[PDB]
Subunit: 141 residues, 4 copies
């Protein structure tokens, strides 16, 4: 009962992130939604809705391919999916090389840097916010 | 996860299922309409009503079903304030929406999304009449 | 009247903050502009454009009254203008009492919590940002 | 001068050049480049948005902007969204798409011009120009 591939990516994310919470206390599914609302194209919105499904849920790149998602979309999701064998800097460098992933990752950083949603702030947060700021600047050069 | 945060996730899953496969005038999935309206809201109470504001027309989603799912009476009343009654005229419908503090705000963001012509392929004369009606209602909901 | 007073408020702010900068080096004039962009009414936008003119520049309250800004607008600006002998805690409590000042202050805290423009984030910012979060929550309480 | 950054100078130039001008909604025109600039993502886009309509002002010219310190690629971007005297609108939109910064600014320009939430009413005379905005908006979206 799906009309468009953007609707499918939503239903996949809502199901996959069901039961997860972000560090602010809210349902995690609203993070890819808030990133998707910052996007400008349907391709960016699809990747934004799924950008944390491979890392955090049972969704795999293989599953997305078998569900009909195009090669450039899945590769764009993989460009914003960190591998353990790489540093965070090498991950952001790999994100910038992808036209769709670069834009989605920028909006992902913006959402993660939105401290207006948080209850407090600790020293562990500012070290994480700092590398977000460095990655945010790198992706805008 | 708090009760309001749980209801907000619950409200999303109820909207996704109810609007599954539905399309709007442009042809895109209708679910993104409540989501775009929600993104304009400021509080979680408003976000919940925004996500469910067009689900009463669905057969599975009723007022008692939402009460059964844990949504409090004030939230459900807000959803009913932005749900047009059977024989109710548009002018009478906007008047009823302003009486509800949450529904009034949600209806404003609903009008903003409906006035967004960046998603339309072409504008006709019928669209002008419809957009003029949204402008009048938008202005009415912003007064004191 | 309101469309012209909004423009006048912009021109008063531009002239008053001219050449001032924030901690990131960006032009400070855009802080009231970005706060005014988050507002929903013309009264809020006017107060937001002028909310740091008394404290940071040579604009006075009598000056704004002389230019035609109504009493409620000037009072709202004063509700978000910290006094000398007033602590930050009492300042936030006083800004919540004014309907327009409360809303503009909320958007002011949102702009001050925007770290997308800072070059880096240190530990001294923890105190400032947590203070802003606490003040943000107090203003949102109903 | 008494200006900090090129962005601030661009603001002051737009403020002066549009001073007293009014838009279709009856508001001060200066807030149009500001609202276009609020949609932009980089400082280069914001500078061009703030100045995207200053060339009509007799004081503001390409030479003036170069004199003030604005880089040539910024000035060329402003000229990419400045329509020529005998140029057709379609040819103007095609020319603005070739410029990376200008394309983005022209999209945000079109979004603001299509924002009918600021309008007090709509007539059928607005149909043609709104359909031109929609057509040009889609044409700039075909890039990706
Ligand atoms: Cl990571
Ligand atoms: Cl939402
Ligand atoms: Cl830039
Ligand atoms: Cl033109
Ligand atoms: Mg993410
Ligand atoms: Mg609706
Ligand atoms: Mg301030
Ligand atoms: Mg323009």
């Amino acid at each position: 009962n799906t009309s468009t591939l953007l609707e499918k990516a939503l239903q996949i994310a809502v199901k996959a992130h069901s039961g997860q919470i972000d560090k602010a206390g809210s349902a995690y599914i609203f993070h890819p939604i808030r990133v998707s609302n910052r996007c400008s194209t349907d391709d960016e919105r699809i990747v934004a809705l799924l950008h944390d499904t491979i890392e955090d849920t049972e969704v795999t790149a293989e599953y997305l391919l078998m569900e009909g998602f195009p090669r450039n979309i899945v590769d764009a999701i993989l460009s914003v999916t960190r591998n353990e064998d790489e540093s965070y800097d090498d991950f952001i460098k790999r994100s910038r090389l992808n036209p769709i992933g670069r834009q989605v990752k920028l909006h992902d950083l913006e959402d993660n840097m939105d401290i207006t949603r948080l209850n407090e702030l600790t020293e562990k947060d500012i070290y994480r916010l700092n590398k977000y700021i460095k990655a945010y600047k790198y992706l805008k050069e």
